[PDB]
Amino acid sequence: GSSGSSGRLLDLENIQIPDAPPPIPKEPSNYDFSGPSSGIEGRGSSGSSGSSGSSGDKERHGVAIYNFQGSGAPQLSLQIGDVVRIQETCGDWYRGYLIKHKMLQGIFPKSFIHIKEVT
């Protein structure tokens, strides 16, 4: 085998994060979702059935690095040090929910989500 030189040996590990987070990007174009017409959310209706078999149980593990403050869906709030279950990915925004608190679901900027790939 053949290997070159290295240069990633320190005593204070710390991700290469900037002093401050960049200006959140612009919302993605008219989403291309698909399902039952949404509107009776306030009224309330049971029925959260979907994937029956094994369509694709391969989600992405991310972590919030910057404190995001939203107002309401589809916008979702996030807190640094929080992990979310990434299901889909549109434009410059992710689609999922807070694993710790599923009670809240929506989208968020990818620039705020740290995709962990330790595997």
Swiss-Prot record:
At the highest ranks, the source species' classification is:
Eukaryota, Metazoa, Chordata, Craniata, Vertebrata
Indicate the family of this protein.
Belongs to the DOCK family.
Subcellular location, in the record's words? Endomembrane system; Cytoplasm, Cytoskeleton
Identify the coding gene: DOCK2
How this chain assembles, per its entry, is:
Homodimer. Interacts with RAC1 and RAC2. Interacts with CRKL and VAV. Interacts with CD3Z.
What is the protein named? Dedicator of cytokinesis protein 2
| Species whose genome carries this gene | Homo sapiens (Human)
Instruction: Please give the tissue specificity annotation from the record for this chain.
Output: Specifically expressed in hematopoietic cells. Highly expressed in peripheral blood leukocytes, and expressed at intermediate level in thymus and spleen. Expressed at very low level in the small intestine and colon.
Q: Which disease is it linked to?
A: Immunodeficiency 40: A form of combined immunodeficiency characterized by lymphopenia, and defective T-cell, B-cell, and NK-cell responses. Patients suffer from severe invasive bacterial and viral infections in early childhood and may die without bone marrow transplantation.
Give every SH3 domain span.
Answer: 57-118
What does its UniProt record remark on the domains? The DOCKER domain may mediate the GEF activity.
The job of this chain, per UniProt, is described as: Involved in cytoskeletal rearrangements required for lymphocyte migration in response of chemokines. Activates RAC1 and RAC2, but not CDC42, by functioning as a guanine nucleotide exchange factor (GEF), which exchanges bound GDP for free GTP. May also participate in IL2 transcriptional activation via the activation of RAC2.
